[PDB]
Amino acid sequence: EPFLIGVSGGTASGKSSVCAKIVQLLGQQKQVVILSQDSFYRVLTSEQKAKALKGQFNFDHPDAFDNELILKTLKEITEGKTVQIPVYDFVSHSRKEETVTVYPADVVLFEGILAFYSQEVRDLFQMKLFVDTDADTRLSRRVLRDISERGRDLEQILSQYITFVKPAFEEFCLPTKKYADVIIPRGADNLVAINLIVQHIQDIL
Numbered sequence: 001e002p003f004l005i006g007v008s009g010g011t012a013s014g015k016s017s018v019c020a021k022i023v024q025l026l027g028q029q030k031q032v033v034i035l036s037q038d039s040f041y042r043v044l045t046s047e048q049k050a051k052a053l054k055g056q057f058n059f060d061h062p063d064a065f066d067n068e069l070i071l072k073t074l075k076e077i078t079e080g081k082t083v084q085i086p087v088y089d090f091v092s093h094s095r096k097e098e099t100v101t102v103y104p105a106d107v108v109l110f111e112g113i114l115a116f117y118s119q120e121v122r123d124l125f126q127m128k129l130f131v132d133t134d135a136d137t138r139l140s141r142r143v144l145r146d147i148s149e150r151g152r153d154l155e156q157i158l159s160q161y162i163t164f165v166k167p168a169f170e171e172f173c174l175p176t177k178k179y180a181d182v183i184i185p186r187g188a189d190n191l192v193a194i195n196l197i198v199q200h201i202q203d204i205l
């Protein structure tokens with residue numbers, strides 16, 4: 001009976017770090033796994049991938065994610081089954097053939113920028129966390145990582161940000177903050193907020 005925790009927030013908000021911190025503090029036994037929604041980006045068409053290369057594709061809209069595959073993988077995980085998670089390559093906007101196998105855990109953290117958007121998926125989480133971080137701090141991280149880990153150009157990133165990221169964060173992501181059981185300002189640095197969450201998780205288990 002995996003205890004699923006949904007974690008969301010805007011891009012570069014510290015969602016994954018927050019999860020790492022929860023995992024690390026549960027250590028101080030319980031099997032924990034961290035899944036990323038970015039792993040379920042849809043398989044782009046030839047025309048769509050052309051747009052992406054030209055920066056005309058909206059990877060921040062709820063439709064960009066394979067919502068259907070997500071609900072399925074999460075549902076089986078909920079059933080204690082062993083699943084296969086896809087691997088996405090942000091450099092080419094492509095789902096690799098390679099899959100990653102995830103075995104049953106006691107706690108499963110699902111983190112993403114739109115993890116709470118779909119109501120079917122949202123109902124699977126027995127706890128929902130929204131990570132809040134200054135938009136300017138986030139942008140700065142987004143710029144450095146993209147240039148670094150996703151081989152991209154400054155101007156293109158800023159342009160993508162202004163055109164899609166922010167307009168989408170505000171329209172689809174932010175409203176989901178109301179569904180959270182705990183909102184976390186300052187992200188991983190909020191050790192007080194993360195310790196209460198951890199304590200809560202342990203009291204339930």
Ligand SMILES: Nc1ccn([C@@H]2O[C@H](CO)[C@@H](O)[C@H]2O)c(=O)n1
Nearest residue numbers: 011038041059060090093113165
């Ligand atoms: N092929 C892709 C797919 C997604 N993304 C960006 O990834 C950020 C969220 O992880 C989203 O903010 C989204 O814009 C990207 O740059 N290229």
